Design an enzyme around this catalytic site. Structure first.
Site, mmCIF file in Angstrom:
data_model
loop_
_atom_site.group_PDB
_atom_site.id
_atom_site.type_symbol
_atom_site.label_atom_id
_atom_site.label_comp_id
_atom_site.label_asym_id
_atom_site.label_seq_id
_atom_site.Cartn_x
_atom_site.Cartn_y
_atom_site.Cartn_z
ATOM 1 N N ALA A 1 0.729 -1.011 0.200
ATOM 2 C CA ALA A 1 -0.002 -0.124 -0.140
ATOM 3 C C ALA A 1 0.781 1.459 -0.096
ATOM 4 O O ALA A 1 0.624 2.015 -0.911
ATOM 5 C CB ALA A 1 -0.854 -0.164 1.224
ATOM 6 N N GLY B 1 -1.883 -5.269 7.414
ATOM 7 C CA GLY B 1 -0.754 -6.227 6.822
ATOM 8 C C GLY B 1 0.114 -6.494 7.697
ATOM 9 O O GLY B 1 0.369 -5.779 8.866
ATOM 10 N N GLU C 1 -6.998 -8.938 10.552
ATOM 11 C CA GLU C 1 -6.831 -7.474 10.500
ATOM 12 C C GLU C 1 -6.722 -6.868 11.863
ATOM 13 O O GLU C 1 -5.931 -6.035 12.145
ATOM 14 C CB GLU C 1 -7.709 -6.588 9.525
ATOM 15 N N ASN D 1 -5.295 6.488 -4.280
ATOM 16 C CA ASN D 1 -3.719 6.970 -4.324
ATOM 17 C C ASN D 1 -3.470 8.343 -4.550
ATOM 18 O O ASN D 1 -2.915 9.208 -4.066
ATOM 19 C CB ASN D 1 -2.796 5.844 -4.903
ATOM 20 N N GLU E 1 5.798 24.394 13.390
ATOM 21 C CA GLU E 1 4.422 25.360 13.554
ATOM 22 C C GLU E 1 3.288 24.589 13.550
ATOM 23 O O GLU E 1 2.278 24.695 14.303
ATOM 24 C CB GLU E 1 4.556 26.575 12.651
HETATM 25 N N1 GTP Z 1 -4.788 2.603 -0.922
HETATM 26 C C1 GTP Z 1 -4.428 1.368 -1.127
HETATM 27 N N2 GTP Z 1 -4.603 0.551 -0.105
HETATM 28 C C2 GTP Z 1 -4.110 -0.772 -0.379
HETATM 29 C C3 GTP Z 1 -3.307 -1.138 -1.506
HETATM 30 N N3 GTP Z 1 -2.919 -2.254 -1.512
HETATM 31 C C4 GTP Z 1 -3.412 -2.796 -0.232
HETATM 32 N N4 GTP Z 1 -4.061 -1.835 0.468
HETATM 33 C C5 GTP Z 1 -4.556 -2.040 1.714
HETATM 34 O O1 GTP Z 1 -3.456 -2.440 2.625
HETATM 35 C C6 GTP Z 1 -4.238 -3.575 3.563
HETATM 36 C C7 GTP Z 1 -3.530 -5.001 3.128
HETATM 37 O O2 GTP Z 1 -2.127 -4.754 3.502
HETATM 38 P P1 GTP Z 1 -1.002 -4.717 2.315
HETATM 39 O O3 GTP Z 1 -0.044 -3.589 2.547
HETATM 40 O O4 GTP Z 1 -1.340 -5.266 1.151
HETATM 41 O O5 GTP Z 1 0.097 -5.884 3.162
HETATM 42 P P2 GTP Z 1 1.826 -5.420 2.956
HETATM 43 O O6 GTP Z 1 2.149 -4.385 3.880
HETATM 44 O O7 GTP Z 1 2.423 -5.831 1.667
HETATM 45 O O8 GTP Z 1 2.360 -6.828 4.175
HETATM 46 P P3 GTP Z 1 2.490 -8.317 3.412
HETATM 47 O O9 GTP Z 1 1.880 -8.582 1.859
HETATM 48 O O10 GTP Z 1 1.582 -9.374 4.593
HETATM 49 O O11 GTP Z 1 3.746 -8.802 3.735
HETATM 50 C C8 GTP Z 1 -5.690 -3.519 2.969
HETATM 51 O O12 GTP Z 1 -6.234 -2.881 4.014
HETATM 52 C C9 GTP Z 1 -5.810 -2.914 1.736
HETATM 53 O O13 GTP Z 1 -7.131 -2.531 1.466
HETATM 54 C C10 GTP Z 1 -3.088 -0.215 -2.320
HETATM 55 O O14 GTP Z 1 -2.563 -0.385 -3.632
HETATM 56 N N5 GTP Z 1 -3.455 1.034 -2.229
#
Ligand code: GTP
Ligand code: TA1
Ligand code: GDP
Ligand code: ADP
Ligand code: ADP
Ligand code: MG
Ligand code: MG
Lengths: 312, 428, 426, 5, 311
Positions: free
Chosen positions: B12, B134, B174, B219, B245
């Site tokens: 993400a 995640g 989660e 994004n 500030e």
């Molecule tokens: N805004 C946004 N949110 C994302 C994206 N991909 C995943 N998410 C959110 O991130 C969460 C899942 O975590 P990820 O960041 O995919 O997992 P990670 O940090 O890569 O960790 P692992 O894959 O388990 O090693 C969920 O709540 C998703 O909705 C993205 O491309 N954009």
């Protein structure tokens, strides 16, 4: 029913100069409070309590039950320098400096020394440890990967375990020492594996032709470890993982027993699989957790208290 | 000088950074290859031959998305050693991202950060992008934050996180990860902004007239908010405001530092006309309960301090008129102990459009950062989810199977309850 | 980089794996001779998952074929895609299995497990970062169940921290070809429930029902069933070799889908599935795929989902689609069918999305379920075992190879314990 | 060989 | 109906018979037929003065060991005058592998068989050392338990009550038990020679063999008894009972003395009977030789009924 006992110790001279202070505050005789958070237990001992009181309030009933056709189990959990060895073995010779196991064997013998000559008894002893989820034998290093099965009446046992006979408490102490001299302990004497000790006492009525078999289980639980604050690498990391998982499984089993749920997860780990017969139902099990009150060891004390409280 | 270090950890965060760097490169007129055909030193460093290298470090335990970056349309921009990659992902495990797999690339990323920090004179802060829920975004972030706090410490740290939604969700474990990371985010961070997918979905539905949003739009919106925050450091204008500030105006007490963001005016191309989009209308619309990016109505709460960051063609008389109109209202209630609860910032640089985007070319836009007491409901829902799932101790054998004790869950729950109690008690 | 070791044991496993390898090679664009004739870079980007490099741009699969009869081996070797396997990976005996679990696991399998383990070890030490093991077999057979169980035990002993997923065909009530099938099924479950990270339950009856009702097929042979199984097996692990918005590994699926260590039995699924001459009258959208996936008549296991509640559901999509649509569908499915899900687990469904659809479609999805209804299959197997064990029928063949009745009793007790575990949460 | 007590 | 085996082992002449000027009258008309006083005396197997303890053991004691291993009680009995060769036949030189008598060889063979089979069976072994001296019962294991009474069981066969029981697991324990018994025999006793020639020593072994799975019960009783010199209440009872049994008249008076009831099991009761009378070819002892030969041949007329002890 489940009985959970907690014991504290007085601060040693090796830490008084550093100026640590008591953290535990008592209320009555069944509650200990740390950082303004109560922890209800079944009974809490203090520094002034002697060994005989602990033995009479924690082991006497189970020792009696073993010699009358029933079964019981006793654990022991704590961190290093928390009182484990003092409350379990102590001085192996002093009439006032002995732990719980010597008093257990002394009573288990002095009851046989009084029941006439019309009764015959048999005593069996086994000593197997759990290491990396593989059962090893402390009395025979040739065996290393023993297995667990069930007999006709679906009461589990470990096959291939060495099972010798004894006739005097001195032999029991000698085999205890020999068994302890083979366990896995890292560099001051940090245990890294669970240990199980079995005392099988069976009686056969010569006149009435009635056979009664009773079992007593002694388990020494290894200490759970928070890895992130230590920096374990390689084998130590695997040992920590296995120990933590086993302790979590045992806690789940004990909680399921205590709450009276329909299904008890008896088949989630090896330790609970072996002790299925002498854990629940009409079996009385007591758990003793030893803690230190010095502020130096507050975190591990809280961990031990939480593990004890999980049972309820 | 005025410079910031950007870190994108997890999928993400990496994709958010993709959008953010696209936006910045568009803003400063830099071609993707790094050659432009002085208001840019904050996010880049010169090389002496016409190439510009951004100040960002990309870290991930899975080689998938970083490989997309390495071979995409921005392969000639980043430094090859900035993009750091592991072998196996966190598998939605806090412990795997924290210690079990984390202790193999953390030294490399610390060395890279040190190499970047040595190259900058006037360091201003950090901008870490991660996600809650995640394994990597909740566990690996804690390790990096702890190491940075030990090493740097006094520098300000800002985070942008994706919070779990009330009903919409993706993972099954989660709540555990969110609880652990929100325990870890209070000791080291200084101002953490949290957003969620559901509010942005509704924002896309109503204002933008798009019925099928994807991650790219979210994004883009987050990148727009971050650019609005950093515009004052980038460009010049009357009533400018920098990070310290911001923190001395927006953080009353040491623990009340969890604001929520909002952007305005989010409009489409067809609805760009037919509306005045004046200062008063923009200011009024930003206090609506339907434009918040966190699913928590401000009406069931009281504000403490809201800082408005105007950018574009803005005249302070209109700002004062809008503030007076806001103050005379009755629906929004301020705390009695904060007679002055507005911070005003104006800049001369208008927003920049991205080609092929849902946003419209408007002459002015605002970004309100406010911290009210209404943020406690999301934490309440997440705590309820955690306790319901942890009563039976489900999915716990995976976490304890990677060298993690059972006490951490209870400790984090206690810390979260303490945070909620503190927030409520300071509210009244 | 996240390699997979594949093993095929038994006739059913060998044929399923052959169809799977044909399908995978078609997906990556590989000629039968092993040359690459693809049309994109994404195919070659992650080719190390299933293949090894060779001189002159040739690729050989990382697969090992094991059987106790030399007939299936040279039936495969003369097939359309038998020219690509490594010849030294063929390990086979001469004495037939004889539909005997005891024989395959004790007498004729102990003399051949050494070579199979040696070739596995030689294949497993040439990888960069091993991820897991794939095994294809059938529980009701003789060589399949026994040999696969022995290999699983040995590998779980050697490699203790790797994912072990097996695709096992399960015996059916109304379709059977062997008289001693329940004995083999129970003796295999006894070890699968212990030494497996995640196993997938498939039966022939559900596949026949799918072919008859949904595809409107006339005369379904084994090829169609093997092809459906290959499709779901390919769809299980698409996130290890193609990019996507949400990426889910094998361990990620295991963590999300397995609440307790014992309950790791899944019923796979696939979508879309239509008959020729009716695809021109279908709209291909996310709601349609979601409706089709959660249909009781689409699962590949003969257990009615309505007689139970789902514990965890994983749905891996493939193609271009909006995330809001997927989230809204996965929420309204749970809310509309609240009584069919476990109440105390919020968000029972996990979503994984990849942006590389299968060739010839636009959207595809795989359904991986974990429902309490899987208890009734074990109930039927246990009842048949009890019926045939009171009289000790067909028991002198097993005891003639070095077995005991206590093994049967322990296996029955373990299966009953599993059934009790699943019933608890209903 | 046993050793009863 | 098991047979009673009468065994005749001859000994070399001592000093007193040379001082009388004895002649070697006895001649072996074969290994079982012997001639004394110019009269034949046929037994089951007659041993010579040059016969070794090993040969006597090989010829005699194997079958009784097999029987007690099967579950049938066995009896080995020694008879003769003072210096007739009874005690030296029983033990001789225990530390000497050649001179070791019936007891050490029996113990060694029992332990050899135990070490040989070691199947899914359990063996419990107990031993009791017993003595009779002027019809006085005294156990040497515990000196205080004197004047004990022999009691009766449900099967109504005599057995000693109050004798101390001691389990054995290795031959060294048997050797130490024998040493302790002899040491206690040296306590509260004036002369060992007169006590040996005027008292009776009883060695008792009991075995309980049970299978682990089938759980069959097999038990056996082994009696090793040496009596006093034949040159008396006990001897009056023995002579009367043996002569009556050879005659087959009336009954065997067992209440005459304790040894009679004790030997009821050994003689005519539920126990295999095998006696080894030790004889001397001396004319100085031609009277006692004649008495021993007549006693043995009269006893040979008796056959016993024995059943296996299974419960
Ligand atoms: N805004 C946004 N949110 C994302 C994206 N991909 C995943 N998410 C959110 O991130 C969460 C899942 O975590 P990820 O960041 O995919 O997992 P990670 O940090 O890569 O960790 P692992 O894959 O388990 O090693 C969920 O709540 C998703 O909705 C993205 O491309 N954009
Ligand atoms: C004109 C058109 O669109 O034709 C479709 C088609 O009509 C349908 C009916 C196909 C067709 O599939 C079958 O009839 C079938 C036969 C045996 C076993 C299983 C299915 C199709 O044959 C199959 C084929 O599938 C593929 O091309 C996928 O890539 C698939 N490939 C294979 O299975 C394969 C077959 C032969 C050789 C190599 C590979 C796949 C699926 C998952 C993972 C990897 C590959 C497709 C879309 C079609 C036809 C051609 C008619 C269906 O199947 C698949 C797997 O897509 C049956 O229901 C679906 C829906 C499709 O619309
Ligand atoms: N899908 C499929 N199933 C098969 C095939 N061959 C056998 N089976 C099934 O496998 C089971 C029989 O086991 P089998 O593998 O033939 O015995 P083995 O050769 O000893 O392992 C039965 O349930 C069959 O229906 C096949 O080619 N494809
Ligand atoms: N209840 C107690 N009263 C007095 N001293 C104690 C007590 N418990 C422990 N100690 C002291 O602690 C010391 C070491 O404790 P020990 O049992 O060895 O812990 P560990 O086995 O974890 O090292 C012993 O020398 C003993 O004197
Ligand atoms: N067969 C023999 N060979 C050599 N010496 C013997 C033999 N039998 C007896 N003697 C010796 O004669 C002496 C008296 O014998 P012993 O067995 O004590 O007689 P008893 O017990 O019959 O009174 C002992 O020294 C003994 O060893
Ligand atoms: Mg990831
Ligand atoms: Mg004598």
């Amino acid at each position: 029913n489940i009985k959970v006992m907690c014991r504290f110790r007085p601060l040693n001279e090796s830490e008084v100069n550093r100026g640590d202070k008591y953290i535990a505050k008592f209320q009555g005789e069944d509650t200990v409070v740390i950082a303004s958070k109560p922890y209800a237990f079944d009974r809490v001992f203090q520094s002034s309590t002697s060994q005989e009181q602990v033995y009479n309030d924690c082991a006497k009933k189970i020792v009696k039950d073993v010699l009358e056709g029933y079964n019981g189990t006793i654990f022991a959990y704590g961190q290093t320098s928390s009182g484990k060895t003092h409350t379990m073995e102590g001085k192996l010779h002093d009439p006032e400096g002995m732990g719980i196991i010597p008093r257990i064997v002394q009573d288990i013998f002095n009851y046989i020394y009084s029941m006439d000559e019309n009764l015959e008894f048999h005593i069996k002893v086994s000593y197997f440890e759990i290491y990396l989820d593989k059962i090893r034998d402390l009395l025979d290093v040739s065996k290393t990967n023993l297995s667990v099965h069930e007999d006709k009446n679906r009461v589990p046992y470990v096959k291939g375990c060495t099972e010798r006979f004894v006739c005097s408490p001195d032999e029991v102490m000698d085999t205890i020492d020999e068994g302890k001299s083979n366990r896995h302990v890292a560099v001051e004497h940090s245990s890294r594996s669970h240990s199980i000790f079995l005392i099988n006492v069976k009686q056969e009525n010569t006149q009435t032709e009635q056979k009664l078999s009773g079992k007593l289980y002694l388990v020494d639980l290894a200490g759970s470890e928070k890895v992130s604050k230590t920096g374990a690498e390689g084998a130590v990391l695997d040992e920590a993982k296995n120990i933590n998982k086993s302790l979590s499984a045992l806690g789940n089993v004990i909680s399921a027993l205590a709450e009276g749920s329909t299904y008890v997860p008896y088949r989630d780990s090896k330790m609970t699989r072996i002790l299925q017969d002498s854990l629940g139902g009409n079996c009385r099990t007591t758990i003793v957790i030893c803690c230190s009150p010095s502020s130096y060891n507050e975190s591990e004390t809280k961990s031990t208290l939480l593990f004890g409280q999980r049972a309820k | 000088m005025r410079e910031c270090i950007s870190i994108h950890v997890g999928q993400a965060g990496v994709q958010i950074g993709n959008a953010c760097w696209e936006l910045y490169c568009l803003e400063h007129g830099i071609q993707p290859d790094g050659q432009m055909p002085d208001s840019f030193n904050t996010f880049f460093s010169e090389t002496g031959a016409g190439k510009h290298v951004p100040r960002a470090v990309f870290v991930d335990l899975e080689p998938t998305v970083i490989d997309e970056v390495r071979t995409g349309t921005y392969r000639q921009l980043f430094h090859p050693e900035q993009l750091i990659t592991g072998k196996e992902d966190a598998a939605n495990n806090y412990a795997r991202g924290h210690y079990t797999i984390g202790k193999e690339i953390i030294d490399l990323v610390l060395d890279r950060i040190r190499k970047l920090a040595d190259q900058c004179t006037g360091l201003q802060g950090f901008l870490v992008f991660h996600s809650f829920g995640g394994g990597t975004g909740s566990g690996f972030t804690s390790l990096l934050m702890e190491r940075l706090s030990v090493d740097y410490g006094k520098k300000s740290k800002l985070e942008f996180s994706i919070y779990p939604a009330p009903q919409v969700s993706t993972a099954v474990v989660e709540p555990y990860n969110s609880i652990l990371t929100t325990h870890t985010t209070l000791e080291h961070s200084d101002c953490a902004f949290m957003v969620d997918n559901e509010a942005i979905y509704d924002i896309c539905r109503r204002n933008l007239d798009i019925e099928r949003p994807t991650y790219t739009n979210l994004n883009r919106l987050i990148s727009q908010i971050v650019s609005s925050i950093t515009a004052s450091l980038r460009f010049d204008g009357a009533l400018n405001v920098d990070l310290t500030e911001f923190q001395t105006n927006l953080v009353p007490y040491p623990r009340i530092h969890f604001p929520l963001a909002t952007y305005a005016p989010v409009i489409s191309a067809e609805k760009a006309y037919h509306e005045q989009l004046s200062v008063a209308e923009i200011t009024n619309a930003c206090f609506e309960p339907a434009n918040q990016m966190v699913k928590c109505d401000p009406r069931h709460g009281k504000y403490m301090a809201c800082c408005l960051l105007y950018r574009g063609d803005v005249v302070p008389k209109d700002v004062n008129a809008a503030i007076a109109t806001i103050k005379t209202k009755r629906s929004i209630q301020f705390v009695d102990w904060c007679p002055t609860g507005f911070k005003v910032g104006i800049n001369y640089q208008p927003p920049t459009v991205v080609p092929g985007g849902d946003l419209a070319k408007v002459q002015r836009a605002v970004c309100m950062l406010s911290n009210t007491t209404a943020i406690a409901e999301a934490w309440a829902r997440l705590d309820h989810k955690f306790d319901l799932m942890y009563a039976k101790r489900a999915f716990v054998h995976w976490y304890v199977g990677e060298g993690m004790e059972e006490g951490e869950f209870s400790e984090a729950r206690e810390d979260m309850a303490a945070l909620e109690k503190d927030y409520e008690e300071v509210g009244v | 980089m996240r390699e997979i070791v594949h093993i095929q044991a038994g006739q059913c496993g060998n044929q399923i794996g052959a169809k799977f390898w044909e399908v995978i090679s078609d997906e990556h664009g590989i000629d039968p001779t092993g040359s690459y004739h693809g049309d994109s870079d994404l195919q070659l980007e992650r080719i190390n998952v299933y293949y090894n490099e060779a001189a002159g741009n040739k690729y050989v699969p990382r697969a090992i074929l094991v059987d106790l009869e030399p007939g299936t081996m040279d039936s495969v070797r003369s097939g359309p895609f038998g020219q690509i396997f490594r010849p030294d990976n063929f390990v086979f005996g001469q004495s037939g299995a004889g539909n005997n679990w005891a024989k395959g696991h004790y007498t004729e399998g102990a003399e051949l497990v050494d070579s199979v383990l040696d070739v596995v070890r030689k294949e497993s030490e040439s990888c960069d970062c091993l991820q897991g093991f794939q095994l294809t077999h059938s529980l009701g057979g003789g060589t399949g169940s026994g040999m696969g169980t022995l290999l699983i035990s040995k590998i779980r002993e050697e490699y203790p921290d790797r994912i072990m997923n097996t695709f096992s065909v399960v015996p059916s009530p109304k379709v059977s070809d062997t008289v001693v099938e329940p004995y083999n099924a129970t003796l295999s479950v006894h070890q699968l429930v212990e030494n497996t990270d995640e196993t997938y339950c498939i039966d022939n009856e559900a596949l026949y029902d799918i072919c008859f009702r949904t595809l409107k097929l006339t005369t379904p042979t084994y090829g169609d069933l093997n092809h459906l199984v290959s499709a779901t097996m390919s769809g299980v692990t698409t996130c290890l070799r193609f990019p996507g918005q949400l990426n889910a590994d094998l361990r990620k699926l295991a963590v999300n889908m397995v609440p307790f260590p014992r309950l790791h039995f899944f019923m796979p699924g696939f979508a879309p599935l239509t008959s020729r001459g009716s695809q021109q009258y279908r709209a291909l959208t996310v709601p349609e795929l979601t409706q089709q996936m959660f249909d009781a008549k689409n699962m590949m296991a003969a257990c009615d989902p309505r007689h139970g509640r789902y514990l965890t559901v994983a749905a891996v999509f493939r193609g271009r689609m909006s995330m809001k649509e997927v989230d809204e569908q996965m929420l309204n499915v749970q809310n509309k069918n609240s009584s069919y899900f476990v109440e105390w687990i919020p968000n029972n469904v996990k979503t994984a999305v990849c942006d590389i659809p299968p060739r010839g479609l636009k959207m595809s999805a795989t359904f991986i379920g974990n429902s309490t209804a899987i208890q009734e299959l074990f109930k039927r197997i246990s009842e048949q075992f009890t019926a045939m064990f009171r009289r000790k029928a067909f028991l002198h063949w097993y005891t003639g190879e070095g077995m005991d009745e206590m093994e049967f009793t322990e296996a029955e007790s373990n299966m009953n314990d599993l059934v009790s575990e699943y019933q608890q949460y209903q």
